[model samples]
Target: MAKKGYILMENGGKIEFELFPNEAPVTVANFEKLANEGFYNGLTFHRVIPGFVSQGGCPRGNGTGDAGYTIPCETDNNPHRHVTGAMSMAHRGRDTGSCQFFIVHEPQPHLDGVHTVFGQVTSGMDVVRTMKNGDVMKEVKVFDEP
Candidate 1:
């Protein structure tokens, strides 16, 4: 089974997701590592495009920040599709993603094979849909699913 993670919102809502290490190993590892290191705590979802996605993990609390490093996008040969609540790495260009990530409010098939889909929300999609810019992630934690 894959590992799972949760993003705890400041308002006490939680978003749980299952990691896809087999498909996007690098992205998964990077996200989990940074999350465990407290990299996403208090970071706000700086970009929220209605009917699209809610994004965060930008240290500057803006869409242009990272975790001081970038990781490669593992979209090549990846079978994961971008559906509602799909978690994906955000990048300026090809293979430039780091800490930034986005969860789609609806299925974004256009994004499939373009961005690395590393996780999928298993619960709390309501929290994701209600999220707007400046919604804070109080904490992020990852663990084995058992």
Candidate 2:
């Protein structure tokens, strides 16, 4: 199930993301399921720390919210590191990843094996930086191809 999508930023910018089903099957399936059902529409990037990560996907659009489900942790010793514009899941304690995700605002090598890296910002990373604290995501859609 190969699919692509775009994150429509509030700052009139867009980001193209390629979902990896082979690497992270469960995570990708959950995301694609939610996306197809319009679950990510109108969600906002609720938290943004300058050198940390931009958190979002909370229906309540707050740091303490979630999508009411959790996914198992998928850790790999591969070369994937938390670099700028990297998209990863936000978990509670461990192996409790729900619908919350974050975009790395800067290089965060410390988060390499902690969170699941499902996607990367292939383009428009500046749009990610320009996103305000409460920036709404209008919607997220999965396409057949770019």
Candidate 3:
């Protein structure tokens, strides 16, 4: 089953969404593992291409870091369709995503099959609506539905 996780903004706002476990189990697990350990905390949104995506999760905040290991793209299991609020893994090549993740600013079909879509924003997309480069993630938190 899937559930919402609040990727908190520095300004007290939150981007919350349910994750796709069935569609992308491995991707989802890696995300949760890092997020739970505050790996996404203190990281900057190093790449914010308006009308494209806001990318982060690089421990170094550059465009070249991973989560101590690389994970394969769940593309076949879960294609990165670039849905308006799609959350996906950023990879250098096949099975080479290392903590770099992104949120779609709008529908980006061109990304289909190139990445792994793991989740989507249910609300608060506006908090990052115009987020600039260097914006930091306050935290990434998972919540149990009540």
Candidate 4:
């Protein structure tokens, strides 16, 4: 089975995501490892477009932020379209994905099979949809095995 995690929003909302370690072992492991160590704690959503992507995981919560480390790109060669509430890694340049990630607010078929999709929001689509532009994420935590 795949390992799962949770992203707690500031507005008393939460979303559970299941990480596909089998499909993308390295990427999923890296994300889970980081979450286990509190890498995403207190980080805010740096970018949020109404009907686009809401990027986050930057310690500085700015568009030009990174987690101080980089991970190998895991662009699966399958048909993975960017639908609403899709969770994906944020890349720098090309194949330079790190701790940064984003959630698609609307269907973004243009990003199909290009970005690494680690997970998706099984619920809380409404909460995600209600997020205001420039809304701070407050933090993202991973809770599993406890």
Highest TM-score against the true fold, candidate: 1
Q: Which lDDT tens digits does candidate 3 get at residues 24-113? A: 777777788878888788877887776667787755466555477577766555556888888888776766777787888777778876
Off by over 4 Å in 3: 60-66, 144-146
Each prediction's RMSD over C-alphas, in Å, is 2.0, 2.6, 2.1, 2.9
Q: For candidate 4, which ten residues in a row score worst on lDDT?
A: 137-146
Worst 10 residues of 3 by lDDT: 58-67
Model 1 segments more than 4 A misplaced: 60-66, 92-94
Candidate 2 differs from the real structure by a C-alpha RMSD in angstroms, to one decimal, of 2.6
- Alpha carbon lDDT at 71, candidate 2: 77
Highest lDDT model number: 1
The Cα local distance difference test for each model comes to 0.78, 0.71, 0.75, 0.67
How many clashes in each structure?
A: 0, 0, 0, 0
Q: Write the per-residue lDDT of candidate 2 for residues 1-146, one digit (tens) a residue.
A: 56667887655778777766655667767777777777777778878665567788866465444355577767642344677777777764555888878787687888876778777777877776677777777778776552
TM for candidate 3 is 0.87
Q: Candidate 2, residue 56: CA error in Å?
A: 0.5
Ranking by lDDT: 1, 3, 2, 4
Q: How does each model score on TM-score?
A: 0.88, 0.83, 0.87, 0.80
